[PDB]
Design an enzyme around this catalytic site. Structure first.
Site, PDB file in Angstrom:
ATOM      1  CB  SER A  48      -1.018  -0.042   1.207  1.00 33.42           C
ATOM      2  OG  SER A  48      -1.614   1.245   1.259  1.00 33.42           O
ATOM      3  CD  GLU A  78      -8.340  -7.313  -4.592  1.00 37.80           C
ATOM      4  OE1 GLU A  78      -7.099  -7.133  -3.853  1.00 37.80           O
ATOM      5  OE2 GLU A  78      -9.127  -8.205  -4.374  1.00 37.80           O
ATOM      6  NE  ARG A 100      -2.805   4.784   0.901  1.00 36.10           N
ATOM      7  CZ  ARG A 100      -2.881   4.600   2.353  1.00 36.10           C
ATOM      8  NH1 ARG A 100      -3.399   5.270   2.961  1.00 36.10           N
ATOM      9  NH2 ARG A 100      -2.379   3.518   2.619  1.00 36.10           N
ATOM     10  NE  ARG A 136      -2.029   7.999   5.683  1.00 41.42           N
ATOM     11  CZ  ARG A 136      -1.045   8.666   5.449  1.00 41.42           C
ATOM     12  NH1 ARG A 136      -0.647  10.129   5.772  1.00 41.42           N
ATOM     13  NH2 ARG A 136       0.015   8.242   4.787  1.00 41.42           N
ATOM     14  CE1 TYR A 194      -0.003   2.130  10.203  1.00 43.26           C
ATOM     15  CE2 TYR A 194      -1.623   3.887   9.951  1.00 43.26           C
ATOM     16  CZ  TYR A 194      -1.357   2.452   9.910  1.00 43.26           C
ATOM     17  OH  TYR A 194      -2.099   1.601   9.948  1.00 43.26           O
ATOM     18  CB  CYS A 253      -4.781  12.614  27.936  1.00 40.62           C
ATOM     19  SG  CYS A 253      -4.400  14.043  28.842  1.00 40.62           S
ATOM     20  CD  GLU A 254      -1.557   7.944  23.935  1.00 38.47           C
ATOM     21  OE1 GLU A 254      -2.326   7.384  24.835  1.00 38.47           O
ATOM     22  OE2 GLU A 254      -0.141   7.426  23.948  1.00 38.47           O
ATOM     23  CE1 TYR A 288      -7.020   1.242   4.348  1.00 40.20           C
ATOM     24  CE2 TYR A 288      -6.085   2.717   2.979  1.00 40.20           C
ATOM     25  CZ  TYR A 288      -6.817   1.717   3.187  1.00 40.20           C
ATOM     26  OH  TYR A 288      -6.735   0.784   2.255  1.00 40.20           O
TER      27      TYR A 288
HETATM   28  O1  LIG Z   1       2.022   9.743  27.918  1.00 38.22           O
HETATM   29  C1  LIG Z   1       0.882   9.783  27.467  1.00 38.22           C
HETATM   30  O2  LIG Z   1      -0.089  10.560  27.423  1.00 38.22           O
HETATM   31  C2  LIG Z   1       0.319   8.300  27.017  1.00 38.22           C
HETATM   32  C3  LIG Z   1       0.887   6.765  26.772  1.00 38.22           C
HETATM   33  C4  LIG Z   1      -0.200   5.510  26.446  1.00 38.22           C
HETATM   34  C5  LIG Z   1       0.254   4.356  25.534  1.00 38.22           C
HETATM   35  C6  LIG Z   1      -0.910   3.032  25.666  1.00 38.22           C
HETATM   36  C7  LIG Z   1      -0.492   1.631  25.331  1.00 38.22           C
HETATM   37  C8  LIG Z   1       0.709   1.032  24.732  1.00 38.22           C
HETATM   38  C9  LIG Z   1       1.903   0.811  25.625  1.00 38.22           C
HETATM   39  O3  LIG Z   1       1.879  -0.185  26.451  1.00 38.22           O
HETATM   40  O4  LIG Z   1       3.232   1.537  25.586  1.00 38.22           O
HETATM   41  O1  LIG Z   2      -0.306  -4.233   2.544  1.00 34.91           O
HETATM   42  C1  LIG Z   2      -1.225  -4.490   3.692  1.00 34.91           C
HETATM   43  O2  LIG Z   2      -2.258  -5.081   3.767  1.00 34.91           O
HETATM   44  C2  LIG Z   2      -1.006  -3.595   4.769  1.00 34.91           C
HETATM   45  C3  LIG Z   2      -1.232  -1.992   4.752  1.00 34.91           C
HETATM   46  C4  LIG Z   2      -2.469  -1.323   4.400  1.00 34.91           C
HETATM   47  C5  LIG Z   2      -2.888   0.155   4.572  1.00 34.91           C
HETATM   48  C6  LIG Z   2      -3.754   0.787   5.556  1.00 34.91           C
HETATM   49  C7  LIG Z   2      -3.288   2.122   6.473  1.00 34.91           C
HETATM   50  C8  LIG Z   2      -2.490   3.229   5.891  1.00 34.91           C
HETATM   51  C9  LIG Z   2      -2.070   4.778   6.213  1.00 34.91           C
HETATM   52  O3  LIG Z   2      -2.619   5.385   7.309  1.00 34.91           O
HETATM   53  O4  LIG Z   2      -1.453   5.287   5.218  1.00 34.91           O
END
Ligand SMILES: O=C(O)CCCCCCCC(=O)O
Ligand SMILES: O=C(O)CCCCCCCC(=O)O
EC number: 4.1.1.20
Lengths: 434, 434
Positions: free
Chosen positions: A213, A290, A293, A329, A333, A358-359, A387
């Site tokens: 992708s 298929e 995006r 997204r 990523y 709060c993340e 997505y």
């Molecule tokens: O600092 C913060 O505001 C947030 C942290 C949350 C991460 C969630 C789950 C994944 C893990 O267990 O690391």
């Molecule tokens: O090849 C696959 O099946 C995995 C990747 C798929 C795309 C999903 C999310 C993307 C984005 O946030 O850019």
């Protein structure tokens, strides 16, 4: 700009299909998803106009099975259905929505490495074009289930082509370390297809392959096509004809507006030409892609009002009512999304746009230069059609955003927002906790 | 095994709170979240017991403000509410849930870098213990809002201590490049507090600080406490007294049964000992902590039935009906979760476990040693009670899973699963698309 063919800037204000973005946000509230009906038509037509060449030199059909997982909103799938588009479903829910969207079964393919008897029955009763079989365990289930229904199931085969590890390192790794497809080299793909030919309740109709992708290079696609087609001749040599050839999706989108990437045209020429080089060895089959995006991504914009401006010694933060739960997204990523102020100011300023969750990862963009952001302004994030809502959730107990469709017919609310009551609509308190 | 105090393996079968895991799966179906009521009680009690020393030595209160964002299922909050636990909310929905769960307002704190006017009104009307002000911009909004309402808003201030880059690199970079809190070093924190003291509709209640999550080292907490207390001393010399000191959450849980981590007792000893060192410069305040993961994580188990066994030339896959949309941790952070076969087989084998979603990242774990996996078996993935259902979604058009609570009173459904009708329950097709 690049890829966003239906947006403009009239008198210092952002417009989507002629509609004032700031006014849409004011009318439907924020955060707000805005999908462009026209942009979807544009993206779809480009795939048709660029591949029409296939139903001329082969006299066979070219089918676009939209990858539902990119965005399966009823109004969207409905719209794509009306355009004669097909559907690439990967679960009981997508098949359900596809059929409700009035998408002909002859244009429906079912993917998935873990198809349940329940999903199989649905596919058989619905008589979908093909079951992109993923494993022998799946074939045995489909066949046994069709026998139960007293019907015949159509089955294609997701294969992992013998791609060259040197030329395309990633493509090779992705096809060998993942959970999908039947390995060709080991002779499992052959083993499967041959196993299917001896079953009385399955009808082999083709082969399928999906290499990735957001690929912005035709090289992998050329290689995929070649290796897939090489397997087709290998099948012919065994006395096995292939009716359909599904090359999946994965064509990149213009997230970055500074550089130009391959278009549907470039992808068509690459595949079509590669395919044709086998015009002799085997009969030219129906061609299926298929796209996900590359069909809805550029049609979506997410609007979010700025409620706070926080200045720090190293960064100037712009806080908006849109968060990662609405569009995952960026935070998931660290992917790029173009961001602008729906209002053109006579001054630029580098700032960072974050949500209210709060993340720490809940950030839409960093060091982005935009027109002076002011409390009350509405920022717009590009390319969220794919997505975006399909991966939205209620993290930090936040309801999913509203969605509107802008068309020549007008602006319509295609998705209602969730209230606090919705957040708990599925929760139940046991008796001793009342 | 570590942290999972209410589960055991009896007759070659896995049990949660004395309940046969496989039978729960047969009865309620899969995928299925299983929450242990007793485990939650144990986690909570461990905090209360480890900190009882605080009130005994200062006469002040020690309050646990459960971080709802880790899991705000109505039953769970209801449970913690009855245990006398407090609530750390970061959205209107969490406050809404908190208040419906009968959590006392004087035990509720509100965090967030983007609190809207609407949410502030809610917090004020509920008269919560305190708004953990994240910026001067928020302070002004709160005061202005409290003004219009003709009420007083209790406010605390989230500060970012000047953590040494060398010592704890990650913790340091966060309190500087992230969007949370008021910088201490630059004087912003002091400026915000001095400013609040002039406003007529705010009530300075204390300071707050949150340094991270899943921390398995006591060292960072000591540094946090010290730098927070140093600031409090500074405020004291400015004629500013502090009622509460909130040190946030962050204590990690034992995902890895291999490594030994700090307990609530180690945390309390580290915090309380450091705190008491300031007893001569400042009056000991109430102590508040915002445990999220360390309260519910080890109480959750996700059960997934295996539908297919795929054998590639290199890996032996096991596909289950539980997917990443049900529990996003593995696929999103590539984090580790312990996984086992609820049925003890006489022989073990290495396999990789994957969900049914068409996303290569949708893998729960690779190369794991489990008891012989067979189609129809039920696997259990440990420690999914935190950031599990709270981050679930409908990716690939799959409704969120069912959840059951196992207690001494019996096992009860606390969350109903979503049907195909639920998936489109918010979608609306415009006239021209019917
Ligand atoms: O600092 C913060 O505001 C947030 C942290 C949350 C991460 C969630 C789950 C994944 C893990 O267990 O690391
Ligand atoms: O090849 C696959 O099946 C995995 C990747 C798929 C795309 C999903 C999310 C993307 C984005 O946030 O850019």
């Amino acid at each position: 700009f690049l890829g966003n063919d239906t947006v403009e800037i009239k008198d210092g204000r952002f417009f989507i299909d002629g509609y004032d973005a700031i006014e849409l946000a004011e009318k439907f509230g924020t955060p707000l998803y805005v999908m462009s009906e026209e942009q979807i038509k544009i993206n779809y037509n480009r795939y048709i106009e660029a591949f029409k060449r296939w139903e001329e030199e082969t006299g066979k059909e070219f089918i676009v099975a939209y990858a539902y997982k990119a965005n399966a909103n009823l109004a969207i799938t409905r719209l794509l259905a009306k355009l004669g588009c097909g559907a690439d479903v990967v679960s009981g829910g997508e098949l359900y929505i596809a059929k409700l969207s009035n998408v002909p079964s002859k244009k429906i393919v079912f993917n998935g490495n873990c198809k349940t008897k329940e999903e199989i029955i649905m596919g058989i009763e619905a008589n979908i074009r093909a079951f992109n079989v993923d494993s022998i365990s799946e074939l045995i289930l489909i066949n046994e289930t069709a026998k139960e229904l007293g019907e015949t199931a159509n089955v294609a085969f997701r294969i992992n082509p013998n791609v060259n590890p040197k030329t395309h390192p990633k493509i090779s790794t992705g096809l060998k370390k993942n959970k999908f497809g039947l390995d060709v080299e080991s002779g499992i793909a052959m083993k499967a297809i041959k196993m299917a030919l001896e079953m009385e309740y399955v009808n082999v109709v083709g082969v399928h392959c999906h290499i990735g992708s957001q690929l912005t290079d035709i090289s992998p696609f050329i290689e995929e096509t070649r290796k897939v087609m090489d397997f087709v001749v290998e099948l012919k040599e065994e006395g096995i004809e292939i009716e359909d050839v599904n090359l999946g999706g994965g064509l990149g989108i213009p997230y970055y507006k500074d550089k130009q990437i391959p278009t549907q045209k470039d992808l068509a020429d690459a595949i079509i030409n590669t395919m044709l080089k086998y015009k002799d060895k085997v009969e030219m089959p129906n061609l299926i892609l298929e796209p996900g995006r590359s069909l809805v991504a550029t049609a979506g914009y997410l609007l979010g009002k700025v409620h706070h401006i926080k200045e720090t010694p190293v960064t100037k933060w712009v806080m908006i009512d849109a968060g990662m739960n609405d569009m995952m997204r960026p935070a998931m990523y660290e992917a790029y999304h173009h961001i602008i102020n729906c209002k053109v100011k006579n001054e630029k300023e580098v700032v960072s746009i974050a949500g209210g969750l709060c993340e720490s990862s809940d950030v839409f963009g960093r060091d982005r230069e935009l027109d002076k952001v002011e409390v009350g302004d509405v920022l717009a994030i590009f390319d969220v059609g794919a997505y975006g809502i399909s991966m939205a959730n209620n993290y930090n107990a936040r309801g999913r955003p509203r969605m509107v469709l802008t068309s020549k017919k007008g602006v319509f609310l295609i998705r209602e927002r969730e209230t606090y009551a919705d957040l708990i609509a599925k929760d139940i308190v046991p008796p001793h906790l009342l």
